[PDB]
Every structure is written in C-alpha cells, then in structure tokens.
From a paper:
The coronavirus 3C-like protease (3CLpro), also known as main protease (Mpro), plays a crucial role in processing two polyproteins (pp1a and pp1ab) encoded by the virus RNA genome. Inhibiting the catalytic activity of 3CLpro has been proven to be an effective strategy to block coronavirus replication. In this study, we have identified mutations in SARS-CoV-2 3CLpro that confer resistance to WU-04. To understand how these mutations affect the WU-04 sensitivity and the catalytic activity of 3CLpro, we solved the crystal structures of these mutants and aligned them with the crystal structure of the WT 3CLpro.
The M165V mutation directly interferes with WU-04 binding. In the crystal structure of the SARS-CoV-2 3CLpro/WU-04 complex, residues M49 and M165 pack against the bromophenyl ring of WU-04, suggesting that these mutations directly hinder the binding of WU-04 to 3CLpro. We purified the WT 3CLpro and the WU-04-resistant mutants and measured their inhibition by WU-04 using a fluorescence-based enzyme assay. Both the M49K and M165V mutations increased the IC50 of WU-04 against 3CLpro by more than 20-fold. Conformational changes in the three regions are also observed in the crystal structure of the M49K/M165V double mutant, but not in the crystal structure of the M165V mutant or that of the S301P mutant. These structures demonstrate that the M49K mutation disturbs the local structure around the substrate-binding pocket of 3CLpro, but the M165V mutation does not induce conformational changes. In contrast, the crystal structure of the M165V mutant is almost identical to that of the WT 3CLpro. M165, located within a β-strand deep within the WU-04-binding pocket, when mutated to the branched-chain amino acid valine, may cause a clash with the bromophenyl ring of WU-04, directly impeding WU-04 binding. The S301P mutant showed a significantly decreased dimerization ability (Kd = 17.81 ± 7.32 nM) compared to the WT 3CLpro (Kd = 0.94 ± 0.21 nM). In contrast, mutations M49K and M165V did not inhibit 3CLpro dimerization. Particularly, the M165V mutant demonstrated greater resistance to WU-04 than the M49K and M49K/S301P mutants in the cell assay, whereas its resistance level was lower than that of the M49K and M49K/S301P mutants in the enzyme assay. The M165V mutant also showed greater resistance to ensitrelvir, while the M49K and M49K/S301P mutants showed negligible resistance to ensitrelvir.
Numbering used by the authors:
A (entry chain A), B (entry chain A): 1 to 306
Amino acid sequence: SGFRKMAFPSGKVEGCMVQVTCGTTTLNGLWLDDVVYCPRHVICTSEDMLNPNYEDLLIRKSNHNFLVQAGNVQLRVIGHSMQNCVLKLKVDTANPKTPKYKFVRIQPGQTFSVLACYNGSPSGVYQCAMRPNFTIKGSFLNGSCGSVGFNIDYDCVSFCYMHHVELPTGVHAGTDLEGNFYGPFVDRQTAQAAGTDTTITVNVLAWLYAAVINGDRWFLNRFTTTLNDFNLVAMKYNYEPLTQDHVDILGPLSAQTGIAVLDMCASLKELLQNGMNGRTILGSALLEDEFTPFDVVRQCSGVTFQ
Amino acid sequence: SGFRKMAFPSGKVEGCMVQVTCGTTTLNGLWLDDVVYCPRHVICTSEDMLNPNYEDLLIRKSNHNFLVQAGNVQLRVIGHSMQNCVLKLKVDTANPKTPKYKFVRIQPGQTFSVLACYNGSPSGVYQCAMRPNFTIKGSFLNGSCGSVGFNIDYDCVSFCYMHHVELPTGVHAGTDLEGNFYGPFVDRQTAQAAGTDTTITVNVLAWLYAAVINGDRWFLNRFTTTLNDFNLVAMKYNYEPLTQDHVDILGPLSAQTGIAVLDMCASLKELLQNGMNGRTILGSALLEDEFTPFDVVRQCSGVTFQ
C-alpha cells in the first residue's frame, strides 16, 4: 500500500547525459547514437539572449567550436545542424550506452520524469506534469538547460521534453526533442506570458481513485451528477473540461474500485464547493493533479521496467 | 528557481538489483561485489510469517535452494549466512556494475531515495524520510521487499535502508544493510505498534528557508522567540524539540537568506497557532518535513553526482 509521487528509474538516461560547451556557455546534452542534442542557445552569450539571430550566430561557429564531454571523454564533432530550437551535433562515436528510445510529443496533462543535470552530470530526478498552459513547475537552476524529461514503457525511453527557458514568473518552458516549443514560448530572454493555468481534472479524479484504494474514503458521498453539471462546477474553479474520453480512461479504476466515474465527480464537486475542512487525502491538503490515470494504475499494480 | 521533492539518480543502484527466489518466495536483492543481500523472510512461506524460527527454517535450506537472477543471468550461490534480519548470499561472480558504496545507519529525520523494485526489476524512485518513530511512508506492494534506500555523496552510494514489513496501519518498516531493524519492529506478521509520530522540526524550518529563497515570503513576520518558548509551541503540536545542533545546521541557510533562525521559528510558531489561512507555501497547504537542511542546500545550489 501507500502512494508516492514516483519517477521512472533514471539509469537509462544518465548514460546519455553529456556536457556541451560552445565558447563560454556550458549546458547539458542528450547523447543518442552518434548525435548529441542540446538547446541551441548554447551558441549565445548573455547579451545575445535579449534578441538572438540564431541563424547568424550559428554561422560564426564551426564544428570545432563545440566541446562535447561524456564524463572525461571528449567527443569529436564532425557535423552540426539546427532543427528548430535544438542543436544536432553529429559525433564520430556512437553512444554505447544508448537505450531503446523514441521521440514523442506529449499532450498537456501528461506526466514525465525529469533528470535535472548540471555540466553534463545528473543531479536529481522528479516527476512533473505538462500544465494545460504548456509550462512545467520544475526545479531548474543555471546550467540545467538541456535536462530532459522522459517516460519508460519497459525497455524504451520515450524522450518528450528538453528544458530551455525559465520564465520571469519562475515557471519553466521547453521543447520536445525536435526543437518545437511546448506552448507559445521562445528561447529568448523577454517578457513571455503564460496563459491561465487550469487543473487537470482527469488527473485529480485518478488521484481520488488512488486514495480510495489506499484507505482514504472520507470524501466519498453517494451524491451523483451529470457530465454537464460537473463541468459547470469545473469552469467556476478553473478546471479542465471533462470529456467522454476522460471517462473511458478512468474505466479500469472505476471497475477496480466499484465506484462509478460520475459518482466520483460528485465527490470532487463537493470537494471544490466545500473544501477539505482541514482533512487530508493521501497526506495532502490540496487536490493533486500530477497523477495521470496511467500513473495510478502502475503504482497500484507494480509495473516494472528494464 | 523552483523547489521539488527530488530523488538521487538511481542508475548506480539499478545495476545492483537482482531477483532472489527461495522455494516459492521471490523478492529483490542487493548485489554488491560477490555478495547478495536480501531480507531473510525469503526463506519463509506465508504460514511461516505468523511466527517464524528463522534459524530452523534456514537450516532446512542449502546453497542451491537460493536462485539469484541478475536480469537473465543466473548467479551460482557458493555460501549463505544470516546476519540479523538480512540474508548474505555469497556468489561466484563479483558484480561488475558495483559502484563505490558504504553501509550507513541513518538517524530519524534524515532523508533518502527509495528504488522500488519487483522481481529484481526497478519500478520507480522517490524521496522519503525516516520518521521519528522509525517508520517510513512509502509505496510498497507485494514483492517490493528487498528494495533499498540510499544516498549518493558524489561517487559513493551510502545504502541505508532495506524494506521488510508493511505494518497493519499501512506504514512501512525495514532494516539497515546489516539486518538491524529501524525501530522496535520485527520481520513477523503480527500486530506491531508504531509510536506517536512527530514532525521533524528542523526539516520544516529548512523548507521554510527554501520558500523564502524561491519567493514565497508571506509567512515572514518580524516576531521573534526564544528556543524554550518555541519548543513550548512545538510540544503542543507534536513537533520534535529543537536543539542548538539544529540551529547550527540551519546556519548557512540563515546566512544566505539573512533571516535569523529564531526569527524563522517565530514564523513557524505563528503558522502552527494560526494555520495557513488557505494560502500555500511552495505549492503545499501543509508544512513539509521531508527536506533536511542538506537537501535544501543541494537543490538551491546545484550539487551534482556521478
């Protein structure tokens, strides 16, 4: 029993974390096969980040201006390219620690494990979620740029995030492994507005299912509600609208607990209108939205990986 | 910026997770050098766990009754011994993935990363703390026994915990890597009472320092208090007594933030007497006590590891 915010084992990802230095800027890179992926702002100075012409700044650079270090081993760069906002450095050595991997662009609300790195050295690992406004609430200091988020199916590491920018509001933004930013953000030191952030409603419901499984059942009423009546409560409290697709993915949790999805929505509706009255759910006084329905099923059944 | 419950990179520990099978019981083992460490209740059936004579049950077993599997490789057992509550299986092959390691018995209040495993396969990683009553609030299903907790200095993995028993209350208990249980618990399926659990006061204060560093400063008053006056508030709300040693380890945090330790204690005293009034601190509506002063310094400075 017990429920914890759990991150995937980071071993398969640590073996791909290298250090990329271009001039004075040093950040982290993802070494897969014979290609190193890193944020393209490694080619920028501090003044450049105000308004950088990345095409021009990349032209001034050659292959030998990029220093890639895998621990203590230097990697000779034999080619460089810019795909959107990431830099693709072709090296002469294929990474022997390369795991099975894909490049996946996740959707808002999905979760992934983040391996925070500095100077190509792994520092820590934590689980976070892609907010509906395409930001993430992570822990990123200077030098963490190039840290990657990922999911592990079993033997396959689905890389889905690379950190690029910390917004002036303290939240973070980045791209997928093809350089395409999540959301309207850009890799430039300017005032960037993140939209209104809502709560991932389907994640809150799955977390409530995890609580019933683990003994916390005080929030269970026998009130029920319709999908439209609940979404009327969801819009008032800045919750994402619940669709039939969300009900379908909560199916197995509803079958294991024997609690209908709409019955749990009425419990959440009462939680939103009345609060928690000082009580706790799974050791939390707030409504958690960083557990997808898939995350709850994994932890409540013991799904392992390589 | 940003503050997250961060776990150490688990790569160095994944390479030591093997599967130990004795009869019908299968659990996880820690393969270091040419010795595999696992809970001694691998030799017990389900009926045995009610009241097991471990010396007798071990005598019925021989070296060939223990099946150790490192992924797909079988490890021939050439010797077995019982040290307290752990089983030491000597194998013919030294683990090539053995990192630099020590065996350390942590104190209550300290934190460590837990690598939850099943059938010798790593499943997830999360950070937890040794409660003052020597329990831990983890996520452990059937088969997770043998999962280890650890800390990483830089290249050295300080193994400090092995999971053995889930108490009937849902909390978990285990031993160090020498088989000595943390607390008064035993590896037997019986009614085991865990003492009253208190809040790690020094951890709450360091977490409040992390909040001031990250912008959350609404709880800052200019009230002050004495060490004895605060401990009078601590005893009422089931908090651990604060000592001068606790003030000394919070020194660097007090120097970085410029906030005296006793000034922060008065802020916590107001938080205990008045609550949080619906506000949040670092995204939490409760007072977090699973961040040691060392954990805050690491995350607020970027300490990396191998």
